[PDB]
Subunit: 482 residues, 4 copies
């Protein structure tokens, strides 16, 4: 909705203010030579109380970062939002963040001095100096930087000096928008995993699935005491989330046929559709991978030794652990699964759409996922930045980036495209501070995602426009979920 | 999803195309006309209470004949309950005097696999009115300029229930707001007067100043001065609201003063009303100022000894011909504009009471800083986008323009300073004309009585299109971020 | 909520008006000697478009009834409700009802003449004379008859003369409140059936359950061609609802152990808890029923002939068909299942409460069912009538019905209770017209239901009060479901 | 479920009992007092903006010392988000000046198994304020007069953060509305004046009639007459709203007229204000009528030649001692009543602006027939039931009464005409006194400064209890059907 983007706009402005004035987050003593700041979303793997954003402060010469959790309040929430924010800021410090920033309207109808009030309470009662307060006047949504010059610091913060272990700089997200690990998971996999969780919630007495005798025999050799299901699904707990993982993994991905190592490579296909609908995905085989290489490995290794190979090429156990981490991460980031593991209303809704309209590759399913990526994945923020920056360039000069064609007439080329994408990128990293550094790659993950979901056109670029955004499609995504 | 009204407009356009492709959808075999064209438009507020989602007008080889079909559109979000509403709504529309009615409803719901057949069956079994058609639709393609093209099928045709005019009615799907006379503040003050009078219909009456009452009695010896100076004859609720609003807020005692006379010299008083201009710069003016120099022209003809003071009063109340409107003519035209806009914004009932939306507008003006506040401007913009149907208009312009420039980004341009292409004012007029031809001949969402000035000025003022009127590769630059805010508001 | 009870109050008043004036539903010709009218809920087995109520008109000497479907509108719905009502009235006639009655506010803020408007449209366009229009002024909720004298007929109806086949008088409900068939179904059964429907919606490829070899062999003799599962679950379609029935029946009630006829009686128990939580319920055995009687029947009948007996004592097939009809009826009446068979939001919610708070016998589960019976089962109407009638009797004379005790002091006895219950009953049948005729039984089903759910106290009666209603408990039930 | 406020009251009562059973919940080992009693009450509107769900007052063996704990109650319906709100709310309460704060939150949520431990941990780790206690609860038993008895456990105690008064503050959980001076119409007109002034703070000022301005100048030669006759000195927003409301609606020019003099004869004018009486019979009266015969007493002392006209004006503005309130004394007491009720109904901000609820009340009066309409009466009744906390009061009376009569239906009765039991006025006073002893000593929801007249009259007038004051076997007969409507309204 509107709230997610506005928090992103304010987080960008906070990051800019700390770069302009490091004394907002540092005491007079310990002022560093150079600090950089950048805003990002909060990774779902962090604790329950979710922040509106994170601002990372990096120091010159170090490899560590100090992270500030951001809480953003709108007037529509009313003055009750102030007391929510104070509690949330204490929650963010309890979670382990070096600081927290409360960003709230400069005045309300009821209250002339809301930020002064929040500052007073923090000063009088809390005694935590790691919580900053910022107040704002209404943002300019025509700008690339809607909150530029419209946010003042009413209370600075100081990072708690009793911090011996500092956060690594390469940790955490580097953009405000969510990067999906674009290889292992699919729309169909989210659908089936939620389906298994709905199945297990209705029949907790469900019998564990049975492995083939050759597989169960092989597990006996490598892990003589271990339970074979726990072994090949790489689980140790019996919690709800791990059990659903077990059924999902053995039912949908590592099916009996896929767990067949050789026939020679068997050419097995899983039961999980690729997003492109052409076929079902493949696990451990297809090129010269595990099954095909082990077939070649048997030119000499024994037949029994092949099972040890199956369980820098990931085996069944290693892939099961990484794939579990992916689907767990993504489902939480999309807010489709509770921390406890039950499906949320949104997770149930996506599952319902898939069940009603022909599965995870249906238009209704693709459209609901896209709407989730726009709101919950914060691609609305990203689209706003690309739009306002592009409009600013092209309103000034509609022929920007074009190159002389045969007659001298301008044409927007692939070189034009790459120059324009690089300008957008340095603008996002240096001016807006909405992304950080850890090539025709600049925005490949974002643009492929956006194009696949219909938010940017199959034509990658057009003269006078840049990335041709299907804004009506984005408008529709913004409207969903009531 | 998109806007409910916009989806209704997309369906009305597709229905109008379907009637042109197959006139047997609304005509019996013997009733086949020589040539039939159809177009979709909004329903005028002046029509009955049960408001239709749209109107489709059918013209034949006849010269002055038009046949109107009232359209009701249902969304799955309304649920299976909407189907029964639509049957009742369709009967309401025929009762209002429409020749036919069309129900446009989803092909399936989660609850019910066969909704349109249900409506056809119920109409066949019980209603016995053959003037109601049923159309079923699959989800629209919002990528297209014509989202329902080929996605709507007729499940039940209609037959026209047996004088009619063709030059009558609105000619666009989007509403034309009457430019020049009314403002947000006027809508607000008028709704406040109607709410005050609704609670206290008896006690108040306005007081004219004595010189004016003496002047009216000499101009119109028998007429009641209030009825005279407000140009009213009825005693209906809506008329009394007008009388109070006119004298309380616009033709106030100061504004009704034709001239100031000091020591043989006549001068226009410089009166200002109590109604803010939309731009917030000052209060608005009547009979004086930059639009109407009536008082200044009268004072100059008194100072030159061309006219008596008695003749001056005649000119003030009666106007000066060419061009300069008098009090009575201004009151009557102002009453007609403000009545029309308030009904079309659906802020007022036919009875004259504020609607829920009029109440919501009034409350925003009262609490958040008046009719020129950001909250009031946002509420009006949302109303124009939704109730005025500019969401459908913006979609048409966007898709039609994207279709041109995606194929050729230099479309319409002309050789400029370096020889380089330039999108000029000529380019704009060529592009606007192509948009007109598509809107009337391909989409069938407008008909002939060239510019789009009224629409674009309104959209520009509420921030939905850019302050620059055109850009190369784009045409009219639409601010969809602003459009999102208006769509989400829910009036 | 408030709407359900108000429709019941208006339906009672409509039934009273037709008794006072049969010309409201009969033309001048064909005026009958004597007609009686009574209001009831609409049985869930009737079509999708559900009426707010039914009013039954019975004629003297006949065994047939003419039924009027009632649609009630509130001002809070606004004038849009009028056009809804016209369409609904046409829907009710299409469903096969002899007449329909639209009951709407006498005026709205917007509209001075709403009932005149509805009458005009019906007259001008519809041409159906079987639809009546009634208008009302605000009801008096202190009265036993809140709409008494406050409803006028703006448009009468006439029953379509082209009706050769008349509805039987013994058909349909005889009360405004829902009677649950108080023997075969339980809270646990609704819970498990919804659970099976949630299971099957997630895995439609689910394998059919397997019968014991002796059972499958026996089915081969009685129904040589029939599929044994379809045979013992007594199903013929393959629709969603019938399949969920099959899994539910074989998983939960006719389990493998319960399907064991003999060991002698086996003493099998099902997997469905009784509402009292003491044990699981029993099917076909326990007294001298099917299993025990067939054991006695084998004193002579063959062992093979016993299977024919198993499949006026209902067998497996006969009980499966009647029990299916019960659970189908009740779930639809509670609005927990769509006509298509998918669980509704309320059905899912009840299932969720049972899953989260310890099952169908939990307080949260009992409380949600009770809240459903108060609103969806319309026991709010019934409680209002008992309350206002009782208060009227006892406010007049607080010692009403008491009998002289040892000292002459009044005591409210069991005879006092039965006299008071009978007065309430004739008042409900003769004055309010909210129940019909097809003993210490007067309200046994309603009171047992109400007491079990905590709406009336375990003490059945008290002096000065009558049925002691726990009105605070009813208030809480009225508030749920947002 | 029940009402959110009622559940908060049930928890405050149980907290107060828990402190009496274990004073170590709020006192350090060295801070153990001689004897401690605790009671729950509402928080007075005169306290700061962040309003608590309740107050628990602790009295020690000290004579004038009271220690107040601000209570915040969270429901599962508020979700895991309410936990963080409560931490912030608790800090707000200590900042307001309370000695301690208590968070009362569910033992589990669907999302989170261990909510109260979360709050304890966060407070321990970051806040560093030991004056905030955390209590966890299992679902309440609404069958009981004490629904949380034994169902609330202390997860974190508090220690009182280091003058204090004991005779201060409200003495009941339910709010006492000040009877006699204000009406629904007064609340409505006052909110309208504040909304008008909020939009136009500059332009308006009220005009006193000339005789009164001359009289004030002679009585108070230096004082500004408006400040004098409205008994104000400040220029705050709330004060200006008072001045306009007083002169526009109550002490109108007619009502400010002390006498009418015709041919040597003095008479009370028979003025009526512009504020309706609650019963709708007439407009209300000031200084005249059935409550105050001040004008009649002055006119009778003029006619008897006991006093001058100058002395008559002194008596009118200054009152007559016994008993008869003058203009200034009436203005000051009326201002204090209306300010208190509006703040306690939460219809006005401390700043003087209408709240969302004040706006909702005003809109209902404006659109649905004024402050005495069924919709306005229903909105007020819902406010008293919810914001005034009479839902908890009714639950206490109901359960306490049911407990008595279920054991003995003839409880309190006395031998009547036939020898048969009768529930008499003596029975009622005995039963009311037992209710008092339970409310103060068992439930701890009221404390000593006998009748319940203020509460019962209010409840009776809004239809929540019966017009007959008592009935055998019942006590006070409660109309739970009416109570349902009020609970469902959501202000």
């Amino acid at each position: 909705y509107d709230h997610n983007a506005e928090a992103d706009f304010a987080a960008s402005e906070v990051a800019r203010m700390l770069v302009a004035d490091p004394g907002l987050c540092y005491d007079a003593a310990s002022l560093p030579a150079s600090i950089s700041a950048s805003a990002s979303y909060e990774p779902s793997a962090a604790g329950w109380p979710k922040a509106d954003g994170l601002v990372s402060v990096l120091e010159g010469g170090t490899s560590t970062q100090r992270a500030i959790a951001l809480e953003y309040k709108r007037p529509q929430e009313g003055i009750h939002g102030l007391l929510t924010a104070i509690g949330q800021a204490h929650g963010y410090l309890h979670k382990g963040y070096s600081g927290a920033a409360i960003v709230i309207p400069g005045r309300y109808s009821s209250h002339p001095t809301p930020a002064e009030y929040v500052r007073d309470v923090l000063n009088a009662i809390s005694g935590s100096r790691a919580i900053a307060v910022f107040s704002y006047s209404p943002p300019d949504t025509t700008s690339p930087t809607p909150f530029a010059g419209r946010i003042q610091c009413v209370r600075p913060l100081v990072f708690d000096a009793g911090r011996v272990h500092l956060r690594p700089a390469n940790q955490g997200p580097k953009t405000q928008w969510v990067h999906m690990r674009e290889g292992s998971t699919t729309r169909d996999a989210f659908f089936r995993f939620l389906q298994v969780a709905k199945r297990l919630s209705a029949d907790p007495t469900a019998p564990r699935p049975t492995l083939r005798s050759e597989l169960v025999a092989a597990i006996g050799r490598l892990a003589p005491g271990r339970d074979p299901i726990e072994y090949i699904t790489n689980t140790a707990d019996n919690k709800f989330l791990t059990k659903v993982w077990q059924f999902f993994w053995l039912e949908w991905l590592a099916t009996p046929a896929v767990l067949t190592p050789w026939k020679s490579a068997p050419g097995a296909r899983t039961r999980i559709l690729r997003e492109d609908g052409t076929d079902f995905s493949q696990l451990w085989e297809g090129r010269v991978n595990s099954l095909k290489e082990t077939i070649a490995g048997m030119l000499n290794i024994s037949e029994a030794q092949g099972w040890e190979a199956f369980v820098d090429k990931q085996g069944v156990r290693a892939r099961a652990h990484s794939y579990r981490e992916d689907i767990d991460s993504a489902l939480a980031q999309l807010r489709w699964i509770e921390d406890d593991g039950l499906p949320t209303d949104q997770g149930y809704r996506f599952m319902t759409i898939c069940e009603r309209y022909g599965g995870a590759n249906s238009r209704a399913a693709i459209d609901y996922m896209g709407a989730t990526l726009i709101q919950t994945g914060r691609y609305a923020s990203f689209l706003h930045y690309i739009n306002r920056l592009s409009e600013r360039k092209f309103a000034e000069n509609p022929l920007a980036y074009t190159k002389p064609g045969p007659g001298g007439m301008p044409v927007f080329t692939e070189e034009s495209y790459w120059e324009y994408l690089q300008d957008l990128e340095t603008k996002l990293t240096d001016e807006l501070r909405v992304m950080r550094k850890v090539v025709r790659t600049t925005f490949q993950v974002e643009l492929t995602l956006l194009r696949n979901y219909g938010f940017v056109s199959s034509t990658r670029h057009r003269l006078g426009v840049g990335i041709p955004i299907d804004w009506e499609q984005v408008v529709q995504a913004l409207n969903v979920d009531l």
